[PDB]
């Protein structure tokens, strides 16, 4: 039964300007954790697995860190493009369990 706190929940910054997120895991899951984009009306289109490793097109400024229990998502230049909601996800255990969801505004 894994159980994902994200904070913060809801925030608002300025274009270019570092914005911060974390997970905590209630469960150990080494580095095995995801974090999904996905403006309104669109699908979790993925950022980053294994905690950090990004995937193609996936804008410069989104960098995911940490392991075990502490993850830590950095979009560290914001652009009006980017703003939408950002999640956790561990692959690790079944049933995958997701975020609660930090929603950037631009």
């Known amino acids: 039964d894994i159980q994902m706190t994200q904070s913060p929940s809801s925030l608002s910054a300025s274009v270019g300007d570092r914005v911060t997120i974390t997970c905590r ?29 990004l995937q193609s097109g996936v804008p410069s400024r989104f960098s995911g860190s940490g392991s ?23 692959s690790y255990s079944t049933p995958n369990t997701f975020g609660q969801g930090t929603k950037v505004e631009i």
């Open 68 to 90: 075990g229990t502490d993850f830590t998502l950095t979009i560290s230049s914001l652009q009006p493009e980017d703003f939408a909601t950002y999640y956790c996800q561990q």
């Open 25 to 53: 895991a209630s469960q150990s899951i080494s580095s095995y954790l995801n974090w999904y984009q996905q403006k309104p009306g669109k699908a979790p289109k993925l950022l980053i697995y294994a905690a950090s490793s």
